[PDB]
Amino acid sequence: PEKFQHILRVLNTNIDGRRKIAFAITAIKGVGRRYAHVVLRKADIDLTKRAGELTEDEVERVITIMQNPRQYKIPDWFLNRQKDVKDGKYSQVLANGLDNKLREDLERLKKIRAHRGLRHFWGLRVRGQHTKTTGRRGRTVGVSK
Amino acid sequence: RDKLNNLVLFDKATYDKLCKEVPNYKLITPAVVSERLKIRGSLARAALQELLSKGLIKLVSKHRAQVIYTRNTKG
Amino acid sequence: VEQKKKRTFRKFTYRGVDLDQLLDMSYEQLMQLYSARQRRRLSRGLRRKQHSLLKRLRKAKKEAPPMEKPEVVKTHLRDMIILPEMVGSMVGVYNGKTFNQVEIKPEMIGHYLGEFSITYKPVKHGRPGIGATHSSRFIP
RNA sequence: ACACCAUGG
RNA sequence: AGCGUGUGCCUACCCUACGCCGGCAGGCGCGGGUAACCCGUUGAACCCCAUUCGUGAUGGGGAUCGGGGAUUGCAAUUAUUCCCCAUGAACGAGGAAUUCCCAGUAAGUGCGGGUCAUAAGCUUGCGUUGAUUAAGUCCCUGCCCUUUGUACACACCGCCCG
RNA sequence: AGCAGAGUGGCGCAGCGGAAGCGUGCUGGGCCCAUAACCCAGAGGUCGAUGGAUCGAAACCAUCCUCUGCUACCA
Ligand SMILES: [Mg+2]
Ligand SMILES: [Mg+2]
Ligand SMILES: [Mg+2]
Ligand SMILES: [Mg+2]
Ligand SMILES: [Mg+2]
Ligand SMILES: [Mg+2]
Numbered sequence: 001p002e003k004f005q006h007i008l009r010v011l012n013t014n015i016d017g018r019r020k021i022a023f024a025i026t027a028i029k030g031v032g033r034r035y036a037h038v039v040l041r042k043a044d045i046d047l048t049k050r051a052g053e054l055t056e057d058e059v060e061r062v063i064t065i066m067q068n069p070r071q072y073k074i075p076d077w078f079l080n081r082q083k084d085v086k087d088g089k090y091s092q093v094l095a096n097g098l099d100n101k102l103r104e105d106l107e108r109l110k111k112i113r114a115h116r117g118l119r120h121f122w123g124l125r126v127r128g129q130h131t132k133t134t135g136r137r138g139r140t141v142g143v144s145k
Numbered sequence: 146r147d148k149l150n151n152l153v154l155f156d157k158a159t160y161d162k163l164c165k166e167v168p169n170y171k172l173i174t175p176a177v178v179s180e181r182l183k184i185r186g187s188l189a190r191a192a193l194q195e196l197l198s199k200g201l202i203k204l205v206s207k208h209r210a211q212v213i214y215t216r217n218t219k220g
Numbered sequence: 221v222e223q224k225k226k227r228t229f230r231k232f233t234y235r236g237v238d239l240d241q242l243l244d245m246s247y248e249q250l251m252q253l254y255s256a257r258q259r260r261r262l263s264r265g266l267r268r269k270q271h272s273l274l275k276r277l278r279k280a281k282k283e284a285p286p287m288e289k290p291e292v293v294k295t296h297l298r299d300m301i302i303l304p305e306m307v308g309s310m311v312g313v314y315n316g317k318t319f320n321q322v323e324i325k326p327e328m329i330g331h332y333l334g335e336f337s338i339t340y341k342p343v344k345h346g347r348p349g350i351g352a353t354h355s356s357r358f359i360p
Numbered sequence: 361a362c363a364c365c366a367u368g369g
Numbered sequence: 370a371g372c373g374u375g376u377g378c379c380u381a382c383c384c385u386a387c388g389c390c391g392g393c394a395g396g397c398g399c400g401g402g403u404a405a406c407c408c409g410u411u412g413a414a415c416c417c418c419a420u421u422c423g424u425g426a427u428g429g430g431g432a433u434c435g436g437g438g439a440u441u442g443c444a445a446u447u448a449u450u451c452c453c454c455a456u457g458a459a460c461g462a463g464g465a466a467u468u469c470c471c472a473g474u475a476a477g478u479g480c481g482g483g484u485c486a487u488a489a490g491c492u493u494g495c496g497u498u499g500a501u502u503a504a505g506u507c508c509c510u511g512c513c514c515u516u517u518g519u520a521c522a523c524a525c526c527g528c529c530c531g
Numbered sequence: 532a533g534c535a536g537a538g539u540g541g542c543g544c545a546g547c548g549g550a551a552g553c554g555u556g557c558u559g560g561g562c563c564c565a566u567a568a569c570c571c572a573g574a575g576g577u578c579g580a581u582g583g584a585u586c587g588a589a590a591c592c593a594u595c596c597u598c599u600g601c602u603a604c605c606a
């Protein structure tokens with residue numbers, strides 16, 4: 001039924017219209033399953049459609065709700081950047097601002113040279129896990145001279 | 146693994162072949178219909194429920210993990 | 221402190237508030253900007269004789285000649301949070317043997333003073349010794 | 361109708 | 370379902386019902402129990418019955434990491450523990466080797482006690498679903514008893530020749 | 532200078548166009564009370580260099596270079 005164009009190019013990422021919407025839009029970063037289901041419910045569109053069955057007047061509404069969530073009554077405890085450390089905002093950072101925020105957070109930490117930044121610099125484990133018997137990336141060392 | 150490129154929904158050729166197989170198959174299950182054509186297997190369930198609605202196939206068993214139909218309780 | 225595009229002017233300020241207001245904000249009003257642990261710490265509020273360190277952080281920035289920095293308020297208190305008052309002063313934070321010095325920047329607000337002097341040497345490995353593998357055992 | 365099987369801070 | 374535990378002398382902390390508040394962790398308020406008396410008729414999990422997925426490292430897997438919220442405590446950074454949104458690694462049944470097991474047993478599955486201001490991937494007990502294979506032998510690894518041989522007795526991991 | 536042979540894993544080598552392994556060495560496991568022997572896996576490649584043919588090569592052709600054996604031994 002209705003073999004129409006399926007491959008979508010949503011902002012800076014490729015979606016396949018061969019999948020269901022609630023699991024197709026998770027291909028974008030910052031959008032998981034629990035977030036995408038809510039973004040699709042608030043937009044009043046159906047949830048049994050393949051992602052190719054959406055004409056150009058649904059996708060636009062879906063993304064404008066996906067990017068301005070607090071406008072459409074998506075709560076605060078549910079967003080992936082809350083009390084933004086340097087601006088006090090609440091937001092979902094979605095596609096490319098995610099990598100920029102992550103690198104900005106790592107660089108902020110390394111700047112004041114806190115301990116987390118020093119573990120991020122030396123490529124070690126940042127939480128409090130033992131590193132004596134895990135990680136194990138290098139090569140075997142020979143004991144016979 | 147491998148690459149099974151199945152169809153997410155029918156086209157007219159597969160759509161007529163799906164109605165031209167009804168008298169042929171003694172056992173009808175979603176997996177058999179998936180293997181005959183190139184169907185995403187979750188579309189085969191909808192196709193068989195549609196065929197059942199039109200009286201074209203007869204349900205012999207339905208369970209959570211298995212469904213079975215047969216051709217018009219004949220032959 | 222020469223920080224000039226990311227704290228006061230231009231891009232950003234601590235959760236949208238600028239340092240000059242953080243210098244007058246009462247601790248009750250300020251603990252609403254802080255994260256959960258720092259808020260809980262001040263809500264328990266058991267500043268004990270962690271007070272008196274504030275009396276030598278302060279009163280050391282007034283004995284100091286202008287256009288310069290206070291010298292060192294060396295301490296064992298690794299678990300101090302960084303209130304915006306302590307911005308600017310120099311502190312010597314004990315690590316188990318040594319008072320490594322720190323110049324407090326407006327970016328460290330709400331971290332722990334212990335989170336700026338490490339307790340061990342970052343290791344560079346030697347050469348594996350006699351017990352290092354089962355391939356090694358024998359001597360006469 | 362019998363493959364190999366050495367040595368000991 | 371079954372085995373349990375429950376207010377502590379020094380030692381200051383126990384198990385919780387039910388109403389309200391909060392998405393959640395959690396908070397406030399009032400009661401019972403020193404216990405076959407209250408939590409408790411212990412509404413446990415796997416299992417059972419219906420939806421969506423469809424052979425694609427996928428909606429399998431949940432490592433690593435960012436941001437936020439609670440509780441215990443005198444104090445949580447080298448994240449104590451817990452909750453929420455996000456990031457989404459190896460891994461497609463495992464080389465030479467090698468462990469444990471005979472019937473309510475192996476294995477799957479959850480629940481208590483111990484340590485415990487906080488807290489089990491540990492161990493110690495309890496139930497729940499419940500097989501395949503044997504009724505043998507001395508081959509391999511060892512053990513017991515008799516006969517026999519010995520240059521061993523620190524006892525074959527011995528002794529000893531050039 | 533010439534003839535002949537060779538140029539591939541640290542080292543000896545196999546590889547008659549559908550294209551990278553063998554034997555040894557090296558490192559770590561196994562077996563054993565322990566060591567050698569023996570078993571396993573891992574690491575390490577401009578297939579001498581340069582062009583050309585071929586749908587495609589390490590291999591075929593042409594030029595050059597580098598080793599080895601044998602005569603030539605040459606103002
Ligand atoms: Mg022996
Ligand atoms: Mg010898
Ligand atoms: Mg000898
Ligand atoms: Mg001896
Ligand atoms: Mg399991
Ligand atoms: Mg247990």
Ligand SMILES: [Mg+2]
Pocket residue numbers: none
């Ligand atoms: Mg307890």
Ligand SMILES: [Mg+2]
Pocket residue numbers: none
């Ligand atoms: Mg426990």
Ligand SMILES: [Mg+2]
Pocket residue numbers: 491
């Ligand atoms: Mg233990």
Ligand SMILES: [Mg+2]
Pocket residue numbers: none
């Ligand atoms: Mg054994």
Ligand SMILES: [Mg+2]
Pocket residue numbers: 513514
């Ligand atoms: Mg006997």
Ligand SMILES: [Mg+2]
Pocket residue numbers: none
């Ligand atoms: Mg005798």
Ligand SMILES: [Mg+2]
Pocket residue numbers: none
């Ligand atoms: Mg003797």
Ligand SMILES: [Mg+2]
Pocket residue numbers: 525
């Ligand atoms: Mg001997």
Ligand SMILES: [Mg+2]
Pocket residue numbers: none
């Ligand atoms: Mg001798």
